[PDB]
Structures are given as C-alpha cells and as structure tokens.
Design an enzyme around this catalytic site. Structure first.
Site, PDB file in Angstrom:
ATOM      1  CD1 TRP A 136      61.457 -31.356 -28.844  1.00  0.00           C
ATOM      2  CD2 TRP A 136      62.401 -29.330 -28.795  1.00  0.00           C
ATOM      3  NE1 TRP A 136      61.252 -30.840 -27.565  1.00  0.00           N
ATOM      4  CE2 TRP A 136      61.799 -29.585 -27.524  1.00  0.00           C
ATOM      5  CE3 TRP A 136      63.093 -28.107 -28.992  1.00  0.00           C
ATOM      6  CZ2 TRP A 136      61.801 -28.625 -26.475  1.00  0.00           C
ATOM      7  CZ3 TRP A 136      63.142 -27.191 -27.926  1.00  0.00           C
ATOM      8  CH2 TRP A 136      62.451 -27.440 -26.700  1.00  0.00           C
ATOM      9  CD  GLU A 208      62.566 -34.010 -34.554  1.00  0.00           C
ATOM     10  OE1 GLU A 208      61.410 -33.506 -34.494  1.00  0.00           O
ATOM     11  OE2 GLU A 208      63.637 -33.342 -34.717  1.00  0.00           O
ATOM     12  CG  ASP A 241      62.932 -38.149 -31.113  1.00  0.00           C
ATOM     13  OD1 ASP A 241      61.810 -38.722 -30.880  1.00  0.00           O
ATOM     14  OD2 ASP A 241      63.360 -37.097 -30.499  1.00  0.00           O
ATOM     15  CD  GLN A 244      55.882 -33.792 -32.780  1.00  0.00           C
ATOM     16  OE1 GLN A 244      55.171 -33.297 -33.699  1.00  0.00           O
ATOM     17  NE2 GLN A 244      56.676 -33.061 -32.027  1.00  0.00           N
ATOM     18  CE  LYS A 270      55.126 -34.384 -29.704  1.00  0.00           C
ATOM     19  NZ  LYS A 270      54.535 -33.664 -28.566  1.00  0.00           N
ATOM     20  NE  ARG A 404      55.049 -27.535 -34.502  1.00  0.00           N
ATOM     21  CZ  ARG A 404      55.388 -28.276 -33.443  1.00  0.00           C
ATOM     22  NH1 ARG A 404      56.197 -29.288 -33.588  1.00  0.00           N
ATOM     23  NH2 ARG A 404      54.936 -27.997 -32.229  1.00  0.00           N
TER      24      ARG A 404
HETATM   25  C1  LIG Z   1      60.832 -35.261 -31.561  1.00  0.00           C
HETATM   26  C2  LIG Z   1      60.554 -34.971 -30.104  1.00  0.00           C
HETATM   27  N1  LIG Z   1      61.270 -35.684 -29.097  1.00  0.00           N
HETATM   28  C3  LIG Z   1      61.045 -35.440 -27.856  1.00  0.00           C
HETATM   29  C4  LIG Z   1      60.082 -34.385 -27.478  1.00  0.00           C
HETATM   30  C5  LIG Z   1      59.913 -34.149 -26.032  1.00  0.00           C
HETATM   31  O1  LIG Z   1      59.010 -34.994 -25.429  1.00  0.00           O
HETATM   32  P1  LIG Z   1      58.637 -34.337 -24.116  1.00  0.00           P
HETATM   33  O2  LIG Z   1      58.951 -32.837 -24.053  1.00  0.00           O
HETATM   34  O3  LIG Z   1      57.254 -34.723 -23.599  1.00  0.00           O
HETATM   35  O4  LIG Z   1      59.672 -34.923 -23.168  1.00  0.00           O
HETATM   36  C6  LIG Z   1      59.412 -33.683 -28.409  1.00  0.00           C
HETATM   37  C7  LIG Z   1      58.519 -32.541 -28.056  1.00  0.00           C
HETATM   38  N2  LIG Z   1      57.881 -31.815 -28.927  1.00  0.00           N
HETATM   39  C8  LIG Z   1      57.358 -30.520 -28.507  1.00  0.00           C
HETATM   40  P2  LIG Z   1      56.112 -30.174 -29.796  1.00  0.00           P
HETATM   41  O5  LIG Z   1      54.972 -31.248 -29.696  1.00  0.00           O
HETATM   42  O6  LIG Z   1      55.358 -28.790 -29.816  1.00  0.00           O
HETATM   43  O7  LIG Z   1      56.820 -30.351 -31.189  1.00  0.00           O
HETATM   44  C9  LIG Z   1      56.930 -30.450 -26.996  1.00  0.00           C
HETATM   45  C10 LIG Z   1      56.671 -28.945 -26.861  1.00  0.00           C
HETATM   46  C11 LIG Z   1      57.738 -28.265 -27.871  1.00  0.00           C
HETATM   47  C12 LIG Z   1      58.502 -29.448 -28.488  1.00  0.00           C
HETATM   48  C13 LIG Z   1      59.653 -34.004 -29.803  1.00  0.00           C
HETATM   49  O8  LIG Z   1      58.987 -33.312 -30.869  1.00  0.00           O
END
Ligand SMILES: Cc1ncc(COP(=O)(O)O)c(/C=N/C2(P(=O)(O)O)CCCC2)c1O
Ligand SMILES: Cc1ncc(COP(=O)(O)O)c(/C=N/C2(P(=O)(O)O)CCCC2)c1O
Ligand SMILES: Cc1ncc(COP(=O)(O)O)c(/C=N/C2(P(=O)(O)O)CCCC2)c1O
Ligand SMILES: Cc1ncc(COP(=O)(O)O)c(/C=N/C2(P(=O)(O)O)CCCC2)c1O
Ligand SMILES: [K+]
Ligand SMILES: [K+]
Ligand SMILES: [K+]
Ligand SMILES: [K+]
Ligand code: NA
Ligand code: NA
Ligand code: NA
Ligand code: NA
EC number: 4.1.1.64
Lengths: 431, 431, 431, 431
Positions: A136, A208, A241, A244, A270, A404
């Site tokens: 993701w 990631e 990436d 998180q 994040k 998670r």
């Molecule tokens: C590795 C990574 N890179 C970029 C992003 C995207 O950043 P953003 O959407 O704010 O641009 C995310 C977003 N994670 C989620 P999550 O916190 O629930 O896992 C946002 C809602 C569903 C995917 C991410 O995990």
C-alpha cells in the site's frame, strides 16, 4: 448521545463514501490514547487514529507549537524559505542514516511516494516500478499503481510499467527449496521473471519495511539487503516507504535502521506529522544533485510550509527527548507478551507478529490448517468496540484477517493492559 | 539579517531542490497581507503565499480555531465521524450550486483532483481524460497526466489515455472563422480531433475556470457552457478544478457560479484551506450513489480529519461573515483600474486580464506585435521584490510572461495602492 | 562460387540487417530436404527453411497448384469470395477439433496472432494478455508484446496490460513442492501473482503447445489442461499459437490434439503455408458470432486471397493423403533414437526432448551441473554447416543453447541418418 | 450459378466475418482488368483487387516467374541469402530516391509499417508516433495504433504515445487564416498542440502521400515538405507509407517523387506484390547503420524469401519495361476527364480528385452545402455491380462517401471507357 438525527441525516445526505463503513458514533473529543464519543464514552485508540498519532491525541507539545506558528508564520510562497523548514530538513539529514542528506517537505504519504517515484524516474531516465503484491502506497497516480493489496480494479489502466513480486511471508510460505522456505530464492526467482518482462526500463523498487495494510508482514532476515542488491545490480533505486514504520514505531527511529540497509530514497508521513498533514522524502546528496541537474520538479502549495514543518520538528523533538523509540520497545514488548498469552488461551489466534509497537494478530479457524476464520475477525472487532477498544483488521486473499495493533508511542502500561483485557473479553465473547 | 551562514549552509546541504529558485531571504513572521524577513523587512504578499491565503496570514479566526481542535480533536481513524466533518461537508453542499450534494474532505489540490478523476473513471467505466494544453492540476499521477502547462518531460510515459486541447485565449487567438476568433468553433474542431483519437473511453474533461499557472486565462463567454455540452454528448463528466478560483477569489464563491454552468465534480483546496493543507471534492448525490454502488474507494490518513475540517469551516464562515467575496470585487476593481493606469503609462504592458482578485498582467515587447519581452518580466519581478512587493510571473511557450496578482481577500485599499505603487516603480526601474 | 563480389557488395550496400548473421553462401536452388549453394553444394535442411517446409522444398504438388491459381485466380477484393477460401476454411473446421468452427485466412503468424488477440479483446471487452516468459509470437505490435524469449528492449513501452508467467520446464525446474517439481503448483502460484497485478481486465492467455524459439519446451502432462482451467475461471480466452507445432509436425495434425484440450482460438501459419505466406485463425461459432455482433474487424489486402488459400488446401491435402503426420512419428522416432545414441556417445549433450519431428538438443558443459556450454553450441553449428547440414541453435538466459531440429515431414530415412551422421561428426570435431 | 447452396452453406458455417459484407457471387476466374463469377459474368475490376493488382490479374509475366521459383527456390531459413533478394533489394535502392539505400523484404503492408516504426523507435530511442486523423496503416499492433480512419474502438488501449493531427483537406477545409484555408498554418497549429502533449518522446510521423482509405486525400502543395521540416526540427523520422501510392499508381514510381521530399523510411506492399503477399521498407544507409549498431531486430518466417522477392522484381521489371507509370498518367487522365464529364452531368458529384490512376469521387447531396448524400453512394455502388463494375466507396465522419477508383496500370482505354459508362448508368439509375 450518538443518535443526533440531524447529524446522521446530513452525514447521509452530504458525505461521499470512500471505503469501508462509518463507525456508528460521534467523536467529540480525543486525548492521549483515547477518543470520546458523544456520550463521553472513552475509547481506547489502539491504531493511533489512522496509524499516525505516535504522540497520542492532542499532545500538549503539539498544541503549543501549532499555536505558535499559526499565529506567527503559517503558510508561504513556495520559493520562500523559513527556519522550521531548514531545521526539520536538517534534523532529518541528521537522524536518518548515512547516505540520506537532503529532504523535501510535503503533505501526504502518497504525495511523498509520488515525489520519490518521479525522482527515480528522472535520475534513471526509466519508468518501470516494482512493488510487493500486498503493498500500500497511496490512492494517487503512481502510488496507486504500485499498491497491490487493493484498489486496482474498475478505475482504468494502471501506470505503464507497473510490476509486483510476492512479499517474503514466513507465516504463509509458498516457495520451497529443499524442504524449506527459501524466501531468498523466491526473490531471485521473482526478479528473473521481472527481468523477463521488463522493456529494459526498470527505474525503482518500492517497499514498506513491514507491510502494514498488507497484514503486518515483516521482511525477514537479510531479505532487505538481498533486495537492495537486486536493485543495485539493475541500476534501480530502492525506495523505502516508512509512512508508518518510521519515526520509532518499530522501536528504531527508522525501520531500515534495523537491517542496516539504507535505501536511495526514504519517504515519511503518517507518523511524521503525528496526525497532521506533513510528509517528506529524503535522498542522497548525489541523487539530489543529479535530479537537480536534470530539472527535477515537484512544486506544491504546501511544500515547505512553516507551520507543518514546525509541527514535525517538534514531533521529532519530543520523540527524542521523551525517549519514545524505546518506549515503543517496552510497551511493545509488554503487548506482545499479552498477545502471546491470549494466543495461549485461544486457538483462533494463529499468529502474533510485527515489531515494536506495530504488531499484527492473524485470526485463523484452525492452527494446523491456518484456515482463515470467516466472520470471526469482524466479530472480535465489533466486540472490541463495544468493550470500548478501537481496533482494525485487514483482510487479503489467502490469509486470516489481521488485527493491526498500533497504539501511541506514548501509551502507558495500564493502557496496554487495559487493551489486552478488552481484547481477551472480545474474543471470548465472539467465539 | 538574512545572511545567517549556518542557515544558508544547511539549506544548501539539506534541501532537495524542487523547482524555481529560493528567495534570498529568511521569512521570520507573517501577518495580514505581509511577510517579514529576518531584518524585519515587510513584504507585501501579492500572491497570498502560494495563491492560498484568502484570509491573509495568521488570521486571528484561524489561529482561534486551530488551537481549539489541536487541543480538543485532532486526528482520527478514517472510519470515525465527527462534527467539523459533517458540518463542513454540509456547508459545502449548501454553498455550492445545485447539483452538488456530497463532499469528500482531503488534504491537497492534486489529491482532490485524483479523487475526482478516479471517481469519473469508476462511474463511466472509462479512462481517457482531456484537459487544456496550458493546465495545471498537480504533481501526482493523474493530476500530473492532465497538466500541460509543464512537467511532462523526463519522467516516463503519462497515464494511458491522456489528451489536451487548446484553451480558448482571446489575448492570443489562433483559430479564425470569418475574419474573427471563433473560439467556439475551435472547441468543436478540437473535440472532433479528440473524437478521432479516442479508443472510445472518454471518461472526463478537467478544467480550471480561469487557467492560472497557464497565464490567467479566462474561459470566454459561453465556452464553459458549450464545453459541458461536449461532455454531455459524450457521456463524459466535466470536472471543474477550483483550487484557486474557488472560495470567492474571482468575486463569486465559485467561479463556475458566474457562467451558471455546474460541473459533475468540483474540486477545491488552496483557497479552502487558506494556507493549511485541506482539500475537497463535491459531486452530485446521483454520482456519489453510483460511485458507491461500484465500490468507490479513496481512503487516506487524513480524509475526514477534524482539525482541518474545522479550519475550512471557519474559513467559510469568516468569508461569509466578513463578506469577502464582495471585497474581492471592490479591491479587485481597485487593482484593475491601477493596472490599467500603469498600462497607460507603460507600453510593455500588453494585457490586463483576470477577474475579482485574480488578475494577470502580460508583459510584451511590442503591443502591435505582442512580442514577449525577454528578461523584462524577470526584471520587474526582481525589482518588485527589492521595492518590497512579492510577485509571480509565469512564462509559457508563445506568450509574454504573466504576472499573477492575487493578494488576500482581506487586503486593504491602501495595501492595494501601496502595491500598485511599488509596481509602478519596479517597472520604471526595470526598463 | 559463393564469392560473387558483386553479390556480396550489393548485399552489403543494400540490405537492412534484421537479426543474426547472414550465412556465407549463395542459395541457388532447393529441392526436397536440401538447398544447394552457388557451387552446387547440397545442404541438408534440418529446419525446413525457417521451420515451415513440411512438404520440403519445391514440392511438385505445390508447384502444380501454385501455377494453376497464378494463371487462374490470384488475388481479389477482400469482399469477394471464391472456392479455395471456403474450401480451406471448411477443411480447417473439419480437421481441427470440436469447438473450432470458423476460420479467418491471412498471411503471417504474427498477423494470425494479432487477429486472435484482437478478437479476444473484442469479445471479452478486456485487454490484459498473458504469455510465457520464453514465448515467441511475432515481431508486430501485439504479438511482440506477448513475446518474451526476446525483442523486448530498446523499442518503447510494450502494449499496456502485458504479462508473462514462467513456462513449465522439466529439464530445468525452479519450483519445488515436497522435494519435487510441482509445475502445477507453479502455475497456480504464477496466476495468483498475475491476479494480484491485474486491473481486472484479463482478456486471454496465449501459448505455444511446445515453446520452440524458447528452446523446445513441451508443456508437461496435464498442464495445458490446468491452464485452460485458469482461463475459464477468469473469463479469459486461451489462444493456442500452432505456427510450427500445427499441421502434423509433432505427429498429430495439431499439437493441442495430444492433450485433448481445445483452445478458444487456434492460430496457424508457418507449417500451413509450408513456406508460402498464408496464415489462419480458427475459433468457435459462438465466439465468431459474438465477435461479429460486436463489430469485429480484421480487414487486409490478402485476407481471403484465392491463390494462398489454394496452396494451403493442397498442403492439407497432400499431408493427409501422403500420411505425413505419421511419417513425422516414424522419422521423429528414427531421429530421437539417433540423438539418444549421440547423447550416449557425448557428455555435452545434456538433453534430448521435443515431439514428432520437433526435437530439441540442449548443449551443456556438465551433465551434473547442466552448465551451459559456452561457444560450444556455436561450434557444433558451424561444423554442421561445413559438413553440409543446416542447423539452428537458440540460446536464452539460464540454459545451454538448444538445437532445434525440424526437417521436412517428407524427409527420408537415409536423410535422417545422413543428418544424424553429419551431426555426430560436427560434435566430434567441435570438442 | 452463383447459388451453390453448399458453397453458401459452408461459407456461413465456417468463415469468420471480418468486416464489411461478402459480395453475393462466386469468383471463379480473373484475368487482366476482370474477374468472372460462377456464371462467367465478367466484372470490371476498378480497384485492382484490394487496390493491389497494378499488372492486372494473372499477368503472364507473373505467372512465369511464380512458376520458376516455385519449382526452383521457394522458401529458405531467414539467414540464407539468395539472388532474388539481393536483386530486388538493389533494384529498390536504385529506383527509389536518393537517401534510400537499404531495403528489408517482408510480407504485408502493416508488417512493413511495424518494421519501420520499430526502427524509428530503436534509432531515436523514443516511442511517440503521430499520424493523420483519417489514416490507415494496418490491423496490427503499431500500425493499428496509428490508423485513425477506423478500428480504434472496443479492442483495448492503443499503443502508448499515439497521436494524430488533421490531414490537410482542401475539399473540406476547417482552418482559416485571413479569409482562406491556410493548411500550412493548420500544420503548425496541430504540431504545437502535439508539442504540448508530448512526454518528449516523439519518434516519428507516419503518413500516406495520398490518404486512400481516408477518402483519396492528397497532401497539398508544399505540405509534405513543411511536414518533413516539423519532423527534422523535432528529431523525428518521417515515415512515408506507399502501400498503394507506390510503384507508379499515382503516375510516378513513388508518390514522394512528386513533391521532391524524401522520407527517412519508405514502406511498400500492396502494389509491390501486385496481389501477392510481399512487402518492404527502405531506409538510408546511415539509418540502417545506426539501427544495426543498436541491435535492430525484425526476424520473420518470410523475410527474405526468394519466391516473393522474385515476384516483386519481376513486377518492377515489367512496370519499367512496359512503361506503366506513364500509362497510369494517360489512362488516369482519360478517366479523370470522364469523371469530370459525369460531374457535369450529375450534381451529386461534388468532387473529382486524386492523381494518376488513384482517383476519388466524393458523393454529395448538395454542391453548395456538400451535404453527404446518404445511401446514395451505397446505391451507385450496388448499381455498378449489377452493371458489372466492381467499385469501392469509403465513408468517414464529416464527408460524402468516396469512390476509390484504381484500375490496373495495365488497363486499356476501352476498359476505361467501358467503366466510365457503367458508372454513368449506375448513377442515372440510382438517383
Ligand atoms: C505505507 C503507506 N504509504 C502511503 C499511505 C498513504 O498515505 P496517505 O493515504 O495519507 O496519502 C499509507 C496509508 N495507509 C492507510 P492505513 O493507515 O489504514 O494502513 C491509509 C488508510 C488505508 C491505507 C501507507 O500505509
Ligand atoms: C489548479 C490547481 N490544481 C491543483 C494544484 C496543486 O495543488 P497542490 O500542488 O497543493 O497539490 C494547483 C497548484 N498551483 C501551483 P500555483 O499556486 O503557483 O499556481 C502550486 C505551485 C505551482 C502550481 C493548481 O493551480
Ligand atoms: C496505406 C496502407 N498501409 C497498410 C495497409 C495494410 O496492408 P495490409 O492490410 O495488407 O497489411 C493498407 C490497407 N489498405 C486496405 P484498402 O486497400 O481497402 O485501402 C486493406 C483493406 C482496408 C484497408 C493501406 O491502405
Ligand atoms: C510460435 C510463433 N508464432 C509466430 C511466429 C512469427 O511468424 P512470422 O514471424 O512469420 O510472422 C513465429 C516465428 N518463429 C521464428 P522461428 O521459426 O526461427 O522459431 C521466425 C524467426 C524467429 C522466430 C513463431 O515461432
Ligand atoms: K509553500
Ligand atoms: K482520518
Ligand atoms: K483479398
Ligand atoms: K525466410
Ligand atoms: Na543521514
Ligand atoms: Na449545492
Ligand atoms: Na473442428
Ligand atoms: Na535510392
């Protein structure tokens, strides 16, 4: 109460639905490791908002700084520099590994990934991108083209030159070399296939350090390093990436710090903005220099805005000062142990994995089979919520759903215990 | 002083360069229609930061609200609703035209455009996108694929199905029908070509009501409406990008309000967040409904975060209350007049255009020829800065460079006059 | 002599080079299983020209028919029908398996593959194509996008939606399930990856029953059938490319006849035209019908030309009448045995594989290691030529080079023996 | 009779439909400028088969040569050279303009265009291709991506980087500069748009000297030359597709010979093979050399096959010897005059255009309006057929349907007259 009809009415009339389902409550306040509904019910935030609040909610330090800049220096023309920017950029060069010298300050994670990707493409002069099949990276263009855990369907062709290969997954292994999971041989085998499909325009691999949305999947021992070698051998950048995993969530400032493998571009967001919209990419001076020669462009409204920059600096400060990367290790370890006790107690718990305070729990129907337990995960989750614990489960083809778990780095021990408890009860009550 | 070597040193060592050139100063504070350097020099912000600060810098209302939520409700899990969100979403359904019922709250303009685009693609089940050949929609994936004023080169193929057609440009017309500029016939002619290239998968047309980055180019009388008709006839959505024209900048809450032509999706950002990172898209209930049926997904960290939502609501409030859309008309008109007086005074001024407080000034070397004046624009700009007026000129192939003048909606008359003056001097001094 | 300077001069001045290297001779005549140089040297054609001449060179039957139509009915407007066309089309419906009802008559193999591919895309309304990673389908557009044994580099992006998966290869296996090569589990594993990358627009899988250019790689027991099942499950057509395997080369009229697995579209060419430029696709009446409803278009100069149609009909005739599919089994078997005797004699021979008269010989440096023998293959080949036996070796990453042995179906036993001999000598002399 | 039920039955059961509709007859023989049905009815072939038979049907010279090689040297391994190949290649270097030195001998027109295109891409290292919006280059991959007169829909995305611009069309002009059709200014205007859409990877422009399938559209005075200049300025090759205009059809060996503008690659086919499947590309030694350095590959079954090569050589011979390029001028001129007389006679005839023996007749409903006459064209055509004259009308958006008249270069005067007559009658009878 949470039933304000008006509220729900407008909500129904005026909100675009964008995935999942709305929690049936009305959050009225948040503080520390909790959110409070309209009845004043306190909910234990086991995901730190949307996996962002490492300082917890409404951190007094943040609240301080936010105010300062709001009233002092907010937003500027993108060609004007200010101190928070240079400071944060500098801090970042400083706390990141060696080889990471220059930063670009943005607003979102996908944004951060797009910047990185465009940069690799500019400096390699190529365009093919490879990611993991359960990744993701964001909803936007390029970040979405490299996201494989979901979203690929019904919205036109992905970007030209998009590829994925399978993520090394110890819990559910599918590549055997001599009666054992040779994930390193899997990597090779994947790459050869890639090599065979390439038009000869491999620009980067994005990854990631731990796949979160993908089900808390940790790149195993030496994989990351072998991976970097695949890239190097192909003249590809390795982009990590850390939206998180970064900023001490895994109990190291940066996950890549654990493997001692430093990427060509590192992206952050994040946990950097700790809930606020601020992101960044960090690259080597050499890479930055060439990008520049080639005319690199990534100009936005909010690039280099003082207020957000200020907020991130403060976050890094506070994390450092309050020694939160370590607290992630302590608490994490406190939580894992509990998860493992539950696992002792409940057979539906097929796996306890993750690192620091980024733990995953895989629900199965049968340990021997690791048959995903259907509906069970959803139940536990529903139950946690009633019990007052906000949880998140992700479900991909082929696996049990995964909780998670990622509470604030500032979380307390009792808060952990409290959480471990509500969970114990939710499972009991869900079976 | 502005010479802090350390500052400049780190700045040089640790900043990724991302376009243009850094202003040689250090901004230390900002308030109202000014920014102040490290010497305390006051600089008149004629572009409202990066064309965002409609309330000016550090607006006390904003400063108020920012604080509140920072300390009250900051960021939440994307599945949790709160009041600022629903309120802002509702306000938006309310102040936008008819046909615009539901909103999605995000972080950036490109983000907002990506959401819209993905949505059109989802509901049409098609993927070809058409924009203007001097457009700007963002640096990310899809927004970048539809941006033609710049950035197309050296970073791989654009998205599959990308097209542009020429923007109707009265100042520099190239399509004659009967001894006159038939921009409506130009539109037809462009569309036929498009129709001939399409794979039959036209999903949408995206457009800025006034092309800003493109050189303050205003869609002429009835064009917008004819355009909507091209889309309708083709089963395409019309998406209107109001990142800068929206929120009263052109002296209407929304530029599309002037033509009485309502788009299928409207996007907002720059002026919505008034300097902060908040964006949005607004669509019809019918469209939202179908997107939803089809599984529309656009899930981010910051979608629906209370703090930013709160900030935008307050902005809309204050704009409404303080009657700033009108102030844009008054001041704008005050400024145009001055620009026209200068134009009287100076032949290098080939065109005064734009609307409300989004004015453009086109520098030419010869009025009869409209030969772009080379280096002259850059000079004036340099000079404005010395004189203490922050300006912005954009230069595309085929035209004189254009000053983009967009002071805060809250700007005062003297501030306007002051500005008109520094400009008069800068030009004098640049010739 | 072969040294005509003029000849070589012009050849050097006026030929575009298009791969490989020109044989240093001048072919002046050809007949049966031989070609003759300018000295009148007879060369044993072990590849039937470019793997096409199943009837051998200058077959009197062909020579007969060619003349007839040349002087009777040559070429027509593509909308006019004639008997050879309908006859050949009919013959084809007749000799192909069940489910194959209607044919389209073209000119080349890539052409045939493009027709098929376009057809699958039309009827599925999708566009993603999957092939084997060592495939060859042609130099043109789509056929080239699905060809992975070579040609992917230096000529722009491949077609949007192009994928490959590894071909099941018993000789050099890389996917183990329980201490053994589970090529069926490999297929599954590949498909899941594909499923994860798809935009949800999988239209077809294309495959050679035996990968020739890829190194005579035979799809193992039940693979083809499992494959068809992958397609069916995904709503994808299975297109079988029988350019070289078809028409009795493998000792069945059609290779797919051996597995008892009938594809959605079957393509033919090389062996169909037996050296002349004629190709075809065959599909089900149901598929043809839907293609038609949807407006299928594949209109060329030579589609349905009487002369070529006539030539193919005659070829099918003669093959049938002279019972050449069986002769392929007899001779093939005669040849395999010899190859296996050589293999007994020489350790550099690591593998004897293939079917009917489509045999492959894999040169290795060490049987235990199967280390490709470098330069050795090229030597043997050079030597065969001196000894008067035209041979062809193909070399891909990861394997020893492979001799592709495919003499005319009309070849004689002595001709086989003769060949086996020259080869024995060439190897002896090359070590 | 033409009613053989069996014939029609099988035809219905076993033919894939591939566009248009089958002529309700059964062609049993062809000779010279006629085809004969199953009743022995003689049909005057005004399109030379599918616009290919410049020598007419079943030319005794062809019949001679065909036989020779069929029985002498038919098909060979693609790495073996023979005399017909080098001879034809040489002839071609010889009769084509200067700058055209080396040839590649293939099978089809689309094939020829794919080779050329791949070559431009290889040598420029770029991939964007631009054609005319009413072009036709073939059904395959790249040729189809650049074909805009039809086929773009329902079969997936076109190739990445595909563009078209409008063809200069005097009969129906849409770009006015000063009260007149400035087609040269149209070209500029189109190119700027292209320049604005390019990713900076313009590799070539492909063009038919006269758009045939597009409605016999002749590039006007100096256009071709200006076009070459657009390409040169952009570092793009100009590829001229002479599938139908080549080989003396327009009364010059090669149409590009008329403008004195020599392209970077010239492609040939239809008229080269004069009904047989043979094509070619011709490029400069410099281009060939660089392609080669870069590894150019375009390897097929039939590249360099002696039989077809032989046939083309003979065709060039006979054309030369029998002075058919001139006969095209004489007859053409005889035909134009007649068409113009008809035009005198009938108002539905809005335009007589084309060159040599490639004439077009545009059916309109009103000369003043040039309103396409609906169904009228289809009628005339139906009628011609009854009257015993095979005709072809093409219909694109925006224009009257166009008769494409292209009898054999060997046609006689009476045959012309005869034709002009049947036509006169068909129109009379259709009104
Ligand atoms: C590795 C990574 N890179 C970029 C992003 C995207 O950043 P953003 O959407 O704010 O641009 C995310 C977003 N994670 C989620 P999550 O916190 O629930 O896992 C946002 C809602 C569903 C995917 C991410 O995990
Ligand atoms: C119509 C439109 N849509 C989206 C965007 C992008 O929003 P963002 O970059 O914040 O995502 C913009 C950005 N405008 C500029 P500008 O203010 O100087 O004109 C940001 C720096 C150069 C382009 C925009 O005009
Ligand atoms: C300029 C050009 N280039 C390549 C081709 C394709 O060559 P081919 O289809 O044999 O590959 C053609 C084909 N022309 C027609 P036409 O003779 O009726 O105009 C074949 C049937 C409809 C298009 C062509 O005009
Ligand atoms: C399965 C298949 N499909 C289509 C084609 C292409 O047909 P064509 O090139 O005539 O269009 C081929 C061509 N085979 C070769 P080969 O005979 O040496 O193996 C032609 C020279 C190198 C590849 C083929 O094997
Ligand atoms: K900024
Ligand atoms: K959120
Ligand atoms: K034909
Ligand atoms: K050949
Ligand atoms: Na560092
Ligand atoms: Na509204
Ligand atoms: Na059959
Ligand atoms: Na020449």
């Amino acid at each position: 109460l949470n039933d304000d009809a008006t509220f729900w009415r407008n909500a129904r009339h005026h909100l675009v639905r964008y995935g999942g389902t709305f929690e049936p409550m009305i959050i009225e306040r948040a503080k520390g490791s909790f959110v409070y509904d309209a009845d004043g019910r306190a909910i234990l935030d086991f995901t730190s908002g949307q996996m962002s609040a490492v300082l917890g909610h409404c951190h007094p330090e943040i609240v301080s700084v936010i105010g300062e800049y709001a009233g002092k220096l907010d937003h500027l023309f993108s060609e004007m520099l200010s101190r928070p920017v240079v400071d944060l950029a500098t801090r970042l060069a400083n706390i990141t590994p060696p080889g990471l010298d220059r930063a670009l300050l943005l607003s979102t994670g996908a944004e951060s990934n797009e910047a990185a990707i465009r940069m690799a493409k500019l400096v390699t002069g190529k365009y093919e991108i490879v990611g993991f099949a359960q990744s993701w990276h964001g909803m936007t263009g390029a970040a979405a083209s490299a996201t494989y855990s979901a979203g690929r369907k019904g919205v036109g062709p992905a970007a030209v030159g998009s590829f994925a290969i399978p993520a090394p997954f110890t819990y559910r292994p599918r590549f055997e070399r001599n009666g054992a999971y040779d994930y390193l041989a899997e990597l090779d085998y994947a790459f050869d296939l890639i090599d065979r499909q390439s038009s000869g325009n491999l620009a980067a691999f994005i990854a990631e350090p731990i796949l979160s949305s993908g089900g808390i999947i940790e790149l195993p021992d030496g994989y990351m390093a072998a991976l970097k070698r695949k890239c190097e051998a192909r003249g590809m950048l390795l982009i990590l990436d850390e939206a998180q995993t970064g900023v001490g969530r895994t109990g190291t400032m940066f996950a890549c710090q654990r493997d001692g493998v430093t990427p060509d571009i590192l992206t952050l967001s994040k946990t950097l903005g700790a809930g606020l919209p601020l992101a960044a990419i960090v690259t080597s001076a050499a890479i930055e220099e060439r990008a520049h020669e080639l005319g690199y462009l990534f100009y936005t409204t909010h690039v280099s805005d003082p207020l957000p920059a200020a907020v991130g600096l403060r976050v890094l400060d506070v994390v450092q000062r309050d020694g939160l990367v370590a607290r992630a290790n302590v608490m994490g370890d406190r939580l894992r142990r509990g998860l493992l006790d539950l696992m002792e107690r409940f057979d539906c718990i097929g796996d306890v994995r993750g690192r620091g305070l980024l733990l995953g729990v895989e629900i199965v129907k049968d340990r021997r089979t690791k048959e995903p337990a259907d509906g069970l995960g959803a139940k536990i989750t529903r139950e946690c919520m009633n019990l007052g614990l906000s949880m998140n489960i992700v479900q991909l083809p082929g696996m049990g759903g995964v909780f998670r778990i990622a509470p604030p780095l500032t979380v307390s021990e009792d808060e952990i215990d409290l959480g471990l408890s509500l969970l114990g009860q939710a499972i009991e009550r869900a079976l």
